């Protein structure tokens, strides 16, 4: 497939996505089954003013990724930009 | 020296002895098929405990990067042999040894056959001696996997400036042409030749794939400098095309003019950000082995000086000096345990400079530090010191941060003075805010920065002068292309605004920072600014995934995708805001009979799942005749946000409160007791709940259920079926505002997670078909029907 054809298809796919995300229920469960499970995410950074999606990522982990994660020995970091700016910037106080 | 090359040839080189070859002619090493034995032996020799290099079944046994010398060494050392590069091999110093995995190269497997190639760059005759830096390019399946960079030193006096040369491939430099004197500068530059002389450079980024060949006369005078390469431009598609050439040639030069230009008027492609404080990782005690024989055998570095007492003594060395590369590999193994989190794949690069000399049976101590980042890769500085409190080894280690998924917060989370400190402190923050501020003041004649800072209760927009005309113009432009019975029902926003409207008032109950058309810009804007600050710090892995909650998705895609610019972002997010404000009937207070309830399925009953509440809302919506559904599938059986009618929220709250008080499950009674009985038995509960919910006034307060929680100040039912009619204008906007070119599929591909289809962004007929099924659309239906016509 040509570059500019794919740039046409990816634009119209994006316009669809945003246009219907506008007014459709958000399957946020299956995103949390994509990145935490399928991609095996090791750091969850909530770019927000207050930690809520950190709350929902944590509660997804301690429900259905408590036994799955400890077997692979992977360390999840549930961060939000508002509260854990130290750890995202890596600036521990002495 | 010729006999010394001969003898080192016999101990080292496995070819027919002839030193009569051009150093400038690229050297090809023979294929070395990696085996699990040679890896096991090399790992035990260096003292590598990593599970990555253990032969475990099913998984493919990784290769240590240290082993990359064993393949490469054959070609690498071979570079020092030529009759051009004359010197005693005994008084040869290994200065620096660098390994860089080129980004996109997966680490070596166990069944690989690796193509070895070495080229000779830096043959410089110093007054102290002769530094030879040689580039070994190792390739698997034709593609380069790692680069092996070695700097070697002949001690003595080398006045060999005839065959002295420097063949560096100068880094590429981007040059942004904003001002009219900049193109005047580049056209004043003689060496800037173009393919078409008339080519406009205004608002262009020009890259120079330039490389310099210098012959020397003296230690500083360059007898001739030939700096040349193709000048390309970043196209709107972000493809690179050659539009000009640098063809700089000069004789007795003391330096390059282009390099001086660049250190004042050129910007390096890559900067390595510094932390305020270097993070103390560890200080780990390395120990050299009694004998170097187990390392020398596997490595193939048969310099006797590492093993032979008689050799070491003849070379004025204080003993059978331990292989420096041994201690290097030993210290990286400690970097891999501590800073690579016991992972071999997390290593990008590793450069090690041998400062001092190390003997067998020594008590070294390695001071490791996490100092920096560069584009998501942590920078590790380690030094190695002996018992005598003398630093023997230095080195730098670029280490990939793992998969870090981003989640961007939606609405309701807004507060006063959000992201003010960052707006004062960070440069990039200032830049985002100021850009969006300037856009808003020139476009809509209001300061979003004013609104986030102090939150005025009401904000006037005065069309009072010439400035007021261009502001008012676009205040007539926004419309609702709402779909009603198949025909466009165009409703302009602010019907009051017309050709004779001089002033309009944005009216909020408590403060306009609460009204969604100012939350959405403010939230998104801050998040973008915060992420730009993270990128100016280089703390974001390029392998990261990213998603959003409701509004956040727009902030997430703007940040991690850069699909739409700051002015694009603010216009589209403000359009969304007002398009959702005025998609619903309101009053003077901006109160609508719509909102949300965050329902805990486990609270009403533990056995109560998300298929039970989906049935409950499906049955309540039809029995009441009001509009409500589940709009955010947040946590599985712990939080589902349901947006819809305020009476529909109140009746559903009453239904789930009564079900918890009665302690009866709908899933037990439907499958186990009687079939199609709990349907007519549910409608009496929904009737009872709906008659009490309806009586209450249209602006009824939303109160907390036992499972349910009221989303405070949510007038709009976001993501509900109520504003499916408002999709037709929004798509009409998105096609005008998102550009063909500005979409970069690779940077989106497997990285952007859409909210509709929680599957990584993929451009394939299956994904279009999945989107078409989930919500029918004429463009994607046409595209799947015409799929095989776009491939060719």
Residue B596: strand, helix, or coil: strand
**Bridge partners, residue B32, by sequence:** B114
- Smallest CA–CA distance, residue B405 to chain A, in Å, is 5
Determine the Cα–Cα distance for residues B618 and B615; give it in Å rounded to an integer.
5
Please give the order of strands across the beta sheet that includes B546-548: A78-80, A43-47, B404-408, B546-548
Interchain contact, B740 vs A20, CB within 8 Å: no
Determine the Cα–Cα distance for residues A41 and B750; give it in Å rounded to an integer.
13
Q: Which of residues 26-45 of A touch B (CB under 8 A)?
A: 26-31, 33-36, 39-45
Residue in B276, B641, B755 to test binding to A, most A beta-carbons within 10 Å: B755
Determine the Cα–Cα distance for residues A64 and A33; give it in Å rounded to an integer.
9
Determine the Cα–Cα distance for residues B43 and B55; give it in Å rounded to an integer.
11
Closest Cα partner for B558 from B587, B584, B525, B586? B525
Cβ-nearest to A11 among B632, B724, B740:
B740
Residue B125 burial class via C-beta count within 10 angstroms: exposed 0-12, middle 13-18, buried 19 and up = buried
Residue B531: strand, helix, or coil: helix
Residue in A2, A6, A11, A31 to test binding to B, most B beta-carbons within 10 Å: A31
B chain contacts of residue A84, beta-carbon cutoff 8 Å: none
Residue matched to tokens 């020799």: B45
SS3 content of chain B, % helix, strand, coil (to 5): 35, 25, 40
Q: Tell me if chain A has a CB within 8 Å of the CB of B542.
A: no
Q: Tell me if chain A has a CB within 8 Å of the CB of B239.
A: yes
Question: How far out from the chain centre does Cα B597 lie?
Answer: 35
Interchain contact, B735 vs A47, CB within 8 Å: no
Closest Cα partner for B81 from B22, B20, B19? B19
- DSSP assignment string, B643-660: EEEHHHHHHHHHHHHHHH
What does each C-alpha distance from B498 to B297, B444, B464, B494, B585 come to in angstroms?
88, 15, 14, 9, 21
**Bridge partners, residue B176, by sequence:** B205
HEC-encoded secondary structure of B706-725:
CCEEECCCCCCCCCCHHHCC
B chain contacts of residue A20, beta-carbon cutoff 8 Å: 727, 756, 775, 777
Q: Are strands B143-155 and B628-635 parallel, antiparallel or unpaired?
A: unpaired
Residue matched to tokens 């946590």: B635
- Domain locations in chain B? 1-156+272-401, 157-271, 402-456+512-585+714-754, 457-510, 586-713, 755-792
Q: Are strands B487-492 and B479-484 parallel, antiparallel or unpaired?
A: antiparallel
Superfamily for domain range B1-156+272-401: Hotdog Thioesterase (3.10.129.10)
CATH fit for domain A1-93, picks 3.30.559.10, 3.90.25.70, 3.40.50.1370, 3.30.930.10: 3.90.25.70
What does each C-alpha distance from B536 to A33, A92, B270, B318, B529 come to in angstroms?
31, 19, 11, 48, 10
CATH fit for domain B586-713, picks 3.30.70.3330, 2.60.120.260, 3.30.750.24, 3.40.605.10: 3.30.70.3330
Q: Tell me if chain A has a CB within 8 Å of the CB of B491.
A: no
Interchain contact, B743 vs A39, CB within 8 Å: no
For helices B765-774 and A3-21, the axis angle rounded to 10 degrees is: 20
Interchain contact, B549 vs A28, CB within 8 Å: yes
Determine the Cα–Cα distance for residues B539 and B28; give it in Å rounded to an integer.
38
Determine the Cα–Cα distance for residues B93 and B303; give it in Å rounded to an integer.
12
HEC-encoded secondary structure of B407-426:
EECCCCCCCCCCCHHHHHHC
Interchain contact, B341 vs A44, CB within 8 Å: no
Cβ-nearest to A47 among B531, B783, B790:
B531
Determine the Cα–Cα distance for residues B265 and B255; give it in Å rounded to an integer.
17
Query: The dihedral of CA B53, B107, B37, B44: what is its sign?
Result: negative
- What's the angle, vertex CA B178, arms to CA B177 and CA B184, rounded to 5? 60
Residue matched to tokens 């932390």: B275
Contacting residues for B518 by C-beta, under 8 A, at least 6 apart: B448, B451, B512, B577
Determine the Cα–Cα distance for residues B159 and B124; give it in Å rounded to an integer.
10
| Nearest-10 Cα torsion for B649, B653, B654, B660 | 160
Residue B738: strand, helix, or coil: coil
What does each C-alpha distance from B751 to A6, A15, A31, B606, B754 come to in angstroms?
16, 17, 11, 35, 10
Q: Please state the φ and ψ torsions of residue B8, each to the nearest 5 degrees.
A: -70, -30
Q: What is the CATH number of domain B157-271?
A: 2.40.128.700
**Bridge partners, residue B588, by sequence:** none
Determine the Cα–Cα distance for residues B178 and B185; give it in Å rounded to an integer.
12
Determine the Cα–Cα distance for residues A92 and A87; give it in Å rounded to an integer.
7
Long-range CB pairs of B32-36, under 8 A, 24+ apart, other chains included: B32/B70, B32/B71, B32/B74, B32/B113, B32/B114, B32/B116, B33/B112, B33/B113, B33/B114, B34/B63, B34/B67, B34/B71, B34/B108, B34/B109, B34/B110, B34/B111, B34/B112, B34/B113, B34/B114, B35/B110, B36/B61, B36/B110
CB atoms within 10 A of CB B302: 13
Interchain contact, B723 vs A22, CB within 8 Å: yes
Closest Cα partner for B561 from B753, B766, B767? B753
Determine the Cα–Cα distance for residues B657 and B654; give it in Å rounded to an integer.
5
Q: Please state the φ and ψ torsions of residue B259, each to the nearest 5 degrees.
A: -70, -40
Determine the Cα–Cα distance for residues B542 and A81; give it in Å rounded to an integer.
18
Q: What is the largest CA-CA distance in chain B?
A: 107
Helix spans in B66-123 (H): 68-78
A chain contacts of residue B526, beta-carbon cutoff 8 Å: 49
The enclosing H or E element of A86 equals helix A85-89
CB atoms within 10 A of CB B530: 26
Contacting residues for B529 by C-beta, under 8 A, at least 6 apart: B419, B422, B423, B426, B428, B429, B432, B433
Residue B221: strand, helix, or coil: coil
Helix spans in A22-76 (H): 28-32, 53-64, 67-72
Which residues of B are catalytic, by number? 550
Please tell me the class of the B755-792 domain.
Answer: special
The structure's method of determination equals cryo-EM
Q: Please state the φ and ψ torsions of residue B92, each to the nearest 5 degrees.
A: -100, 130
Cβ-nearest to B719 among A19, A25, A52:
A25
Structure resolution in Å? Answer: 4.0
Determine the Cα–Cα distance for residues B246 and B211; give it in Å rounded to an integer.
10
CB B512 within 8 Å of CB B456: yes
Cβ-nearest to B409 among A1, A49, A63:
A49
B chain contacts of residue A5, beta-carbon cutoff 8 Å: 790
Residue B209 burial class via C-beta count within 10 angstroms: exposed 0-12, middle 13-18, buried 19 and up = middle
The enclosing H or E element of B132 equals strand B129-140
SS3 content of chain A, % helix, strand, coil (to 5): 55, 10, 35
Interface size between A and B, measured as CB pairs under 8 A: 252
Determine the Cα–Cα distance for residues B232 and B245; give it in Å rounded to an integer.
8
Determine the Cα–Cα distance for residues B728 and B458; give it in Å rounded to an integer.
31
Q: Are strands B192-194 and B240-250 parallel, antiparallel or unpaired?
A: antiparallel
CB atoms within 10 A of CB B367: 15
Query: The dihedral of CA B334, B338, B339, B341: what is its sign?
Result: positive
**Bridge partners, residue B354, by sequence:** B393
- What's the angle, vertex CA B757, arms to CA B751 and CA B761, rounded to 5? 25
CB atoms within 10 A of CB B127: 8
B chain contacts of residue A13, beta-carbon cutoff 8 Å: 761, 763, 767-768, 771, 780
What does each C-alpha distance from B481 to B187, B389, B503, B529 come to in angstroms?
50, 77, 25, 32
Determine the Cα–Cα distance for residues B451 and B433; give it in Å rounded to an integer.
12
Residue matched to tokens 């070495």: B118
Closest Cα partner for B524 from B650, B516, B770? B516
Interchain contact, A53 vs B415, CB within 8 Å: no
What does each C-alpha distance from B105 to B13, B99, B142, B146 come to in angstroms?
29, 13, 12, 7
Residue matched to tokens 């280490």: B399
Reported as half-sphere exposure (CB side, CA atoms, 13 A), residue B227 has a value of: 20
Q: Are strands B211-215 and B165-166 parallel, antiparallel or unpaired?
A: antiparallel
Contacting residues for B487 by C-beta, under 8 A, at least 6 apart: none
Q: B769: which 2 tokens?
A: 């078909």
CB B151 within 8 Å of CB B158: no
Q: What is the largest CA-CA distance in chain A?
A: 54
Closest Cα partner for B9 from B78, B87, B93? B78
Question: How far out from the chain centre does Cα B672 lie?
Answer: 52
Residue B610: strand, helix, or coil: helix
Cβ-nearest to A29 among B415, B636, B748:
B636
Determine the Cα–Cα distance for residues B481 and B575; give it in Å rounded to an integer.
13
CB B432 within 8 Å of CB B558: no
Closest Cα partner for B339 from B379, B294, B392, B390? B379
CB B734 within 8 Å of CB A14: yes
Q: Which of residues 35-94 of A touch B (CB under 8 A)?
A: 35-36, 39-50, 52-54, 56-57, 59-60, 63-64, 75, 77, 80-81, 88-92, 94
Interchain contact, A18 vs B405, CB within 8 Å: no
CB B395 within 8 Å of CB B330: no
B259: left (phi over 0), alpha (psi -120 to 50) or beta: alpha
Does B457-510 carry CATH code 6.10.60.10?
yes
Residue of A nearest to B631 (CA): A25
Determine the Cα–Cα distance for residues B167 and B741; give it in Å rounded to an integer.
37
CB B520 within 8 Å of CB B576: yes
Residue in A1, A28, A39, A68 to test binding to B, most B beta-carbons within 10 Å: A28
């Amino acid at each position: 497939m040509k570059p500019e054809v794919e740039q046409e298809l990816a634009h119209i796919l994006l316009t669809e996505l945003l246009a219907y995300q506008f007014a459709s229920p958000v399957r946020w469960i299956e995103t949390q089954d994509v990145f935490l499970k399928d991609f095996n995410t090791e750091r969850v950074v909530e770019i927000g003013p207050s930690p809520t999606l950190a709350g929902m990522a944590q509660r997804t982990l301690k429900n259905k990724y408590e036994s799955y994660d400890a077997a692979l020995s992977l360390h999840r970091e549930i961060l939000c930009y508002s509260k854990d700016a130290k750890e995202i910037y890596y600036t521990p106080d002495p | 020296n010729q006999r010394i090359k001969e003898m080192y040839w016999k101990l080292w080189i496995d070819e027919p002895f002839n030193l009569d070859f051009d150093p400038r002619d690229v050297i090809k090493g023979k294929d070395f098929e990696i085996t699990a034995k040679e890896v096991y032996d090399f790992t035990h020799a260096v003292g590598n405990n990593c599970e990555d290099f253990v032969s475990r079944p099913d998984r493919t046994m990784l290769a240590p990067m240290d082993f990359a010398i064993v393949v490469g060494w054959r070609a690498i050392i071979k570079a020092i042999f030529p009759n051009t590069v004359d010197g005693d091999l005994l008084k040869l110093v290994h200065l620096s040894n660098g390994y860089k995995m080129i980004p996109g190269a997966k680490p070596l497997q166990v069944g690989d056959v690796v193509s070895t190639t070495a080229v000779i760059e830096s043959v410089v005759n110093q007054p102290t001696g002769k530094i030879v830096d040689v580039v070994g390019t190792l390739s698997r399946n034709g593609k380069p996997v790692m680069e092996v960079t070695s700097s070697f030193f002949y001690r003595g006096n080398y006045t060999d400036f005839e065959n002295t040369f420097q063949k560096t491939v100068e880094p590429v430099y981007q040059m942004h042409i904003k001002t009219s004197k900049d193109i005047a500068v580049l056209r004043s530059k003689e060496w800037f030749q173009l393919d078409d002389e008339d080519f406009d450079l205004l608002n262009k980024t020009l890259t120079f794939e330039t490389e310099t060949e210098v012959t020397f006369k003296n230690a500083n005078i360059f007898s001739s400098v030939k700096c040349f390469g193709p000048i390309k431009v970043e196209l709107p598609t972000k493809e690179t095309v050659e539009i000009g050439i640098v063809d700089y040639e000069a004789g007795a030069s003391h330096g390059n003019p282009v390099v001086d230009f660049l250190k004042r008027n050129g910007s390096t492609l890559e900067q390595k950000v510094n932390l305020e404080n270097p993070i103390p990782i560890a200080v780990l005690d390395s120990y050299t082995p009694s004998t170097n024989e187990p390392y020398a055998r596997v490595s193939g570095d048969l310099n006797p000086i590492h093993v032979s007492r008689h050799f070491a003594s003849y070379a004025n060395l204080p003993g059978t000096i331990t292989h420096g590369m041994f201690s290097s590999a030993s210290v990286r193994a400690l970097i891999e345990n501590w800073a690579a989190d016991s992972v071999s794949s997390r290593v990008r690069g590793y450069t090690c400079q041998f400062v001092d000399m190390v003997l067998p049976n020594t008590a070294l101590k390695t001071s490791i530090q996490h100092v920096g980042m560069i584009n998501g890769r942590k920078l590790i500085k380690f030094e190695t010191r002996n018992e005598d409190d003398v630093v023997v080894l230095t080195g730098e280690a670029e280490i990939e941060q793992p998969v870090t998924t981003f989640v961007f917060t939606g609405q309701g989370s807004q507060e006063q003075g959000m992201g003010m400190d960052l707006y004062k402190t960070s440069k990039a923050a200032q830049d985002v805010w100021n850009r969006a501020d300037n856009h808003f003041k020139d476009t809509y004649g209001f300061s979003i920065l004013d609104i986030v800072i102090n939150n005025p209760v009401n904000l006037t927009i005065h069309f009072g002068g010439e400035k007021g005309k261009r502001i008012r113009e676009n205040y007539s432009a926004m419309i609702f292309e709402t779909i009603v019975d198949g025909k466009l029902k165009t409703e302009k926003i602010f019907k009051e605004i017309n050709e004779h409207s001089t002033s309009y008032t944005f009216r909020s109950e408590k403060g306009l920072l609460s009204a969604t058309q100012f939350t959405q810009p403010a939230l998104t804007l801050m998040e973008k600014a915060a992420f730009e600050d993270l990128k100016s710090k280089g703390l974001i892995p390029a392998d990261a995934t990213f998603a959003g909650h409701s509004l956040g998705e727009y902030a997430a895609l703007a940040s991690l995708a850069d699909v739409m610019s700051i002015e694009s972002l603010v216009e589209v997010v403000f359009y969304r805001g007002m398009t959702m404000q005025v998609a619903v009937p309101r009053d003077e207070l901006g109160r609508s009979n719509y909102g949300m309830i965050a329902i805990n399925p486990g609270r009403v009953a533990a056995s109560f799942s998300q298929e039970a509440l989906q049935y409950v809302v499906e049955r309540v919506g039809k029995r009441t005749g009001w509009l409500v559904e589940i709009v955010n599938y947040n946590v599985e059986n712990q939080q589902y946000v349901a947006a819809g009618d305020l009476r529909a929220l109140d009746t559903v709250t009453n239904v789930l409160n009564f079900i918890k008080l009665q302690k009866i499950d709908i899933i037990e009674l439907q499958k186990s007791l009687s079939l199609e009985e709990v349907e007519g038995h549910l409608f009496e509960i929904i009737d009872e709940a709906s008659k009490k919910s309806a009586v209450k006034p249209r602006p009824l307060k939303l109160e907390r259920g036992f499972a349910c929680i009221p989303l405070v100040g949510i007038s709009v039912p976001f993501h509900s079926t109520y504003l499916m009619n408002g999709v037709k204008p929004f798509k009409s906007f998105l096609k005008k505002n998102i550009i063909k070119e500005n979409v970069k599929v690779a940077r989106l591909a497997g990285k952007y997670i859409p909210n509709l289809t929680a599957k990584p962004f993929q451009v394939t007929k299956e994904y279009f078909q999945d989107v078409y099924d989930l919500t029918g659309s004429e463009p994607i239906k046409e595209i799947i029907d015409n799929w095989e016509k776009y491939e060719q």
